[PDB]
Amino acid sequence: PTAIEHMEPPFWWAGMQHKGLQLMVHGRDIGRMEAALDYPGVRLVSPTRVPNANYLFVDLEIGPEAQPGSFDIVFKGDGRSERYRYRLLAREQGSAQRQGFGPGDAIYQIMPDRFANGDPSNDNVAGMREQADRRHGGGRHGGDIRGTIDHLDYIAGLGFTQLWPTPLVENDAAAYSYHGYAATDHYRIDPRYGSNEDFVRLSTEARKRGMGLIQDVVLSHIGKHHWWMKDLPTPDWINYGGKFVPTQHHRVAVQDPYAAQADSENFTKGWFVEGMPDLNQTNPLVANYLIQNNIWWIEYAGLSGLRIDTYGYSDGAFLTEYTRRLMAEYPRLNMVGEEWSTRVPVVARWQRGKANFDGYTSHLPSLMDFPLVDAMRNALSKTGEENGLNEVYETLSLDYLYPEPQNLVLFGGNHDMARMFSAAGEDFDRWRMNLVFLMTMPRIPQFYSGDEILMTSTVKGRDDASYRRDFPGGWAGDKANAFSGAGLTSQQRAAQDLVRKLANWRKNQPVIHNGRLMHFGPEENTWVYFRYNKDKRIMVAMNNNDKPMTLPTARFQEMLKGAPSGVDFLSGKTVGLGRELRLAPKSVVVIELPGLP
Amino acid sequence: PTAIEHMEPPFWWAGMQHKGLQLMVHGRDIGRMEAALDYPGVRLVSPTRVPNANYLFVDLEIGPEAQPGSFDIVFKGDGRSERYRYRLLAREQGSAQRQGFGPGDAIYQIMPDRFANGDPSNDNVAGMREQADRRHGGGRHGGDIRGTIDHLDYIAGLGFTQLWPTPLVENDAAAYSYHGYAATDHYRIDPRYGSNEDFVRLSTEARKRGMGLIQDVVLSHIGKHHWWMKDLPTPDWINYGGKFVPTQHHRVAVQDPYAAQADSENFTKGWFVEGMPDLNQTNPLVANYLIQNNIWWIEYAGLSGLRIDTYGYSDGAFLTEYTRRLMAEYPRLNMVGEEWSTRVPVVARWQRGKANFDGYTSHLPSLMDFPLVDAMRNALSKTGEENGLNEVYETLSLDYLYPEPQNLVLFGGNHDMARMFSAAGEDFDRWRMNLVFLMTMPRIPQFYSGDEILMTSTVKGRDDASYRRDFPGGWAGDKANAFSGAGLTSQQRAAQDLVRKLANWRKNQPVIHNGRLMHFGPEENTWVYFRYNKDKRIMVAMNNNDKPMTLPTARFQEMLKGAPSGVDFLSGKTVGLGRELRLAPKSVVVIELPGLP
Numbered sequence A, B: 001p002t003a004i005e006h007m008e009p010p011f012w013w014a015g016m017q018h019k020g021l022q023l024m025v026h027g028r029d030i031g032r033m034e035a036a037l038d039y040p041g042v043r044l045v046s047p048t049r050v051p052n053a054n055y056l057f058v059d060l061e062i063g064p065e066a067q068p069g070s071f072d073i074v075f076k077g078d079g080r081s082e083r084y085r086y087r088l089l090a091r092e093q094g095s096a097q098r099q100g101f102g103p104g105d106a107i108y109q110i111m112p113d114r115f116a117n118g119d120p121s122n123d124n125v126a127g128m129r130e131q132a133d134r135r136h137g138g139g140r141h142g143g144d145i146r147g148t149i150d151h152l153d154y155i156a157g158l159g160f161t162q163l164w165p166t167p168l169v170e171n172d173a174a175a176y177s178y179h180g181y182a183a184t185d186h187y188r189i190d191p192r193y194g195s196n197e198d199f200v201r202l203s204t205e206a207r208k209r210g211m212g213l214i215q216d217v218v219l220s221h222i223g224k225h226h227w228w229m230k231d232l233p234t235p236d237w238i239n240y241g242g243k244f245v246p247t248q249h250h251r252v253a254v255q256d257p258y259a260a261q262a263d264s265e266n267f268t269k270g271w272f273v274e275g276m277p278d279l280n281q282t283n284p285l286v287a288n289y290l291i292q293n294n295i296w297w298i299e300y301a302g303l304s305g306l307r308i309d310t311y312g313y314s315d316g317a318f319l320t321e322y323t324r325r326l327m328a329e330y331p332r333l334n335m336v337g338e339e340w341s342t343r344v345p346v347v348a349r350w351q352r353g354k355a356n357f358d359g360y361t362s363h364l365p366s367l368m369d370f371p372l373v374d375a376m377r378n379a380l381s382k383t384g385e386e387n388g389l390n391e392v393y394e395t396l397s398l399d400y401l402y403p404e405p406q407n408l409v410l411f412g413g414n415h416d417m418a419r420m421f422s423a424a425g426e427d428f429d430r431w432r433m434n435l436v437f438l439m440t441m442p443r444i445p446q447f448y449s450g451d452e453i454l455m456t457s458t459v460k461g462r463d464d465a466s467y468r469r470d471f472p473g474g475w476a477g478d479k480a481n482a483f484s485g486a487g488l489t490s491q492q493r494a495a496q497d498l499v500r501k502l503a504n505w506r507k508n509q510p511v512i513h514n515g516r517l518m519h520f521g522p523e524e525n526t527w528v529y530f531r532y533n534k535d536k537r538i539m540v541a542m543n544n545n546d547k548p549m550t551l552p553t554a555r556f557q558e559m560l561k562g563a564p565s566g567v568d569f570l571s572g573k574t575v576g577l578g579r580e581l582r583l584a585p586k587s588v589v590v591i592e593l594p595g596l597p
C-alpha cells in the first residue's frame, strides 16, 4: 500500500486552546518507523507504539510560541524515509470567540441528497459503491452542495439564520449511502456532494447571507465500509473486537440508580445496526481522534455549531471530555445533542450546568426538545380530547429541570418523524397553531425543509423514505418549484407565506429571544400565553376546537393590566380584550401589546 | 348557641413539643367574654378578638412544667360568667417517638361504609340528613366501626400491618355522605360509624393484632353542611368570602417557573366542587385549627400516621408549617400525601428533602406513587404493545428525583380508580405480575379491600360507585363471603390465598424492605429484576406475552454470578438458570438465592 495513505488531522492551527495534537498516520509499515521534526514551539513527545505495523500515532505539543507555518515530519527506519509537509495555519480573526446559534436564530434543516441537485454530473462518482436512483425511496437522488448554495437566498429570504444539513462526510456504502449517518471517511466530504473546498464555500456563502452553518456529527459509530475496517488500527478500536453485537437501546441505563452495567455497556458499546460498527471511545486514541476531527471541521469550515447525532450512544466519560474540549476551544459555541426521549428528565440530564444524582457532568449547551414537540403533536392530532393542550402546558412547566431551557432546540419536525402537516392531520388551521407555537416559545426554533409547503408522509410506525421526499424545484424538470412558487397550490403557498412572515418577524423580536414567558393552564383546549418584558408583550391565544370559544379576560389581568385591545399580527385586525377574548373555530391570534412595567 | 357550644380542641396534653395551644370557643355572645384561668405552668395570652360575637379564640402557653390535671377556664362579660373545665392529659409512654408506617409494612385500605356492617341499628341516626340505601351506588350502605373491628383478624391474617380507612369524621350531607371527604365536624366520628371512643378502640384492637391505624385527613375543604357555614367564624374563614368559586385544577401552577398567580391561587383557593367550601389556610386561625385537630387525632387515637387527601389543593406555605408541626411532634411518623399526577417531577416536588428550583421546603415523608401504578397498569393492559413493561422500567429509573423513593406508597388500586383485576383485563396471570411487583418493589405496598378476591369494575373515566362495591361477607345474608370463603370461585380463592402467601412472606423479607434494586431493561415484554443485599437475592422474572420466552442468562450475570437454578416461591417449581431462563406464557417467578459475596 501507498507511502503515507492517511495523515489525520491533515493540518492544524497555531494558537489553539489545547496544546496537544495527536497525529494518526497510516501506511504500510509506518509503525516500524521513527518520526522526527524541527519547528520552533512544536515538541515531539516520543512514540507510544501500537502492535499494528501499519499505523503510527505521533504525539505533538504545540506551544503558545509556535507560529503559523509548515514543517516536515520525517519517518525513518527499515533503511527508508517518508516525509509529510505539516502545516500550522493562522486562525481567522475572532475564531475562538465565534458566536454559536442561539435564541435569536432560526434553523433550516435539509438532507443534502434530497434538497437540490445543482450538478447532475456528481450524482455518480467513478469508483464508489452505489449508483444513484431517484426513483428509490432509500436511494441517492443527487442533491449536492452546488444545489444548496444555489438556494441560499431562498432560505435566508424565508427568515432562517442557520443551516443544518444532515451529514455530508463520505458514506461509501453499496446501499442507503444517501443519509450520511455511516461515515467511511471522517475527513472527506462525499464526492457526490462536492469537495472539502465546496463545503467551506457553502459556509462562506451562507455567512454572506447572514446564515451560520451547523454540521451534523456522528460520534458513536461509522459505516462498515470505512477504510479502518480493512485493517483495524488496534484490536479494541471497534467495540466487541470489531464483531457485530446489537444494542437493545436501554438509554436510561446510563442515568439510572438501579442500572445494570450490562445495560449501560450495551447502550454505549452496542452496535446500532450491523452495517454501523461502534467506536470504542474508552480507547484514548479513538477519543482524541473524534475530538480533533470535530474541532478540525469547526475551524476549517467556519461552523457556527454542531448537531450531535445519537448522543447517549457514546461513552459517557468520552462525552464529558469531548464537550469540555470543544467548549474550551469555542466558549460561545452551541452544540445540540440528539437524545431521543419524550421524558424531560432523560433529556435534561445532558445539558451543561445540570446537577446530576450520579455527579455526571457535561458541557453540552443544547438538546433537541422531543418532549415538547411530541406534546404539541398529540394536542393537535387528538382533536377529540376535551383539553389536549394540557399536555403541552404541563410539559413546558417542567422547564426548571433544564439549566438553560431557552437554549434547547424546538422543531416543527425532522427527517426521523412524520411530516409536520401530516402529524397535524392535514388540518391547516391546527398546523398554523403549531407554527405560531414554534416561533414564539422560549426556545431556538428549527424547521425541516419541505414543511413550508405542507409536504406529507405516513404517520404510522417508522417510514424514513416518506419523510425525505425531494424538495420540489431541486431537480431539473420538476413540474412544481417551491423556490420560485411555480405550481404550488393556494394552500401550499399560504403555508410558505406564513413561514416567511413569522420567521422574518421573529428575527426582530427580542422579547421572543430573551423575554419572560407566562402561560395559563389550558381550559377546554384553549390556551393563552405571553412573552413579555418592559418593552413589549406578545399574547398568543389558540382555540384548538371546531367551535367558537370565549375567554373572560379578567383571568389574564396580571399580564394584560387593563389593555383594552391589541393588533393581531396574523390578520392585522384589532382584537378586543376589555372583558373577553372571542376566538373563532380553530383560530390562533398573535396580539402585540406595549411593554409590561 | 347554648353557653359554650363547641370547645376545640376539647382537651389537650401536658408535654407536647409546641407549647402554644389555641382554643376555638363557640357559643352565643362568647366573643363578648374575656377568659381567665389559674393553673401552674399554663399562661393566658392577652386576647386577640374577631368581629364575630359568637366565637372567641383563646391563646394559651403550656410550659413543660404544667402537670396533667384540669383547670377551669372562666368566661366573663356583660354581667354573666361561663365556665369550661379544661383537661391536660398525661401522654402515653413513647408517644412522641411512635414508629410511623414504613417499608416493612403493608397497608390494607377500606371505605368504612362499604366494608362491614357490624351494627345495622346505626345505619340511620335520628337527626341526620341522609337515609341509608344499600342499592344506591352513591348511598350509605351501613358499614361501621363495629364491622371493621369484627374483621381485624381477617386483615392481619392476610399479612397486612396497617389499616387505612377513608375518613370516618362526620359528613352530615343530604346526599353522598358515605365517602367521608366533606367533613361537617372535624372532632366527631360520624354517628353512623360509631363514637369517638369506638375509633379509639379500633386503634387499640388493631394494635393488639400487630396493625397500625392510618387516618385519612382532608385539609383543603369541608362539606357545605359544616356548622361553620351557618355563622362563619371570620369573614375570610372560607376562600372567596364563603361563596363558590370553582378550581380548574391547574396543579402544576404551584410548581411552574412560568406560572400565573391567577392559576396558583385558583388551585389552592378554588373550590374543589360547589359542595366543598375551601378553607382559607392563609388565615393563621384556620392553619392552627387544622394542625391542632390532626395532632389531636394522632394523640387521642394512637395513630401510626396519616394519609393526606388532595395534597396540593392546600396553601403551600400552610403545608410547610403543617408538616413541620406534625413531624416536630412525632419525628418518626409517616404521612402520605395524595398528589394526583402520573408525572414523577410533580409528585417528587412535595417529598421531604427535595431541593426545589423555587426553594419550596416540605416535611412530608411520603406520597402516593401514581406514576409507577399508572406505568404498570399501562404495561399490563396494552397487550398489543411489543414491550409495554419498558414504561415501568423507565418510570422506576426516575427514582433519583425523590429524596426517599423507598418511603413512597405503591398500591394495587384504590377507591378512585378501576379495580386492580379490571385494570389487568381480568387476566389472572397478568394480575399475578402486578401483585408480585407490588410486594417486591422498593416501596411501601398498599392494597385496596376487595382486590384480594378479584372484585371488578368499569375501566374508563371516573366511575366512583363501581370501585366501591360492598365487601362480600360484610352484610348479614351475603351469599358470597370472603371472610369465610363461602361462595368464592376457585380463582377468587386462589387470588386470596396468593395475597396471604406473598404479604406474609414479605413481612419476613428485610431485603425487600431495605435491600438494593437492580433491574434490567425489558425486552419484548419480558422483565428481570433483583432485590439484593449481603444476606439474600430475590429474583423476579416476568413474561408478559402469551407465548413462551427463553432468555439467555449471560445477560444477568452481575446478579446471578453463576447460580445454576433456584426455586420459584410462587409455584414451588425449580427454575433453571445456567445458560437460559425458560419462561412459560404469562408467567412470573420469584426466586430466592443466597446473598452475593
Ligand SMILES: [Ca+2]
Pocket: A117, A118, A119, A120, A121, A122, A123, A142, A143, A144, A192
Ligand atoms: Ca448531484
Ligand SMILES: [Ca+2]
Pocket: A220, A221, A267, A268, A269, A270, A278, A279, A313, A314, A315
Ligand atoms: Ca456507541
Ligand SMILES: [Ca+2]
Pocket: B117, B118, B119, B120, B121, B122, B123, B142, B143, B144, B192
Ligand atoms: Ca351499620
Ligand SMILES: [Ca+2]
Pocket: B220, B221, B267, B268, B269, B270, B278, B279, B313, B314, B315
Ligand atoms: Ca384549597
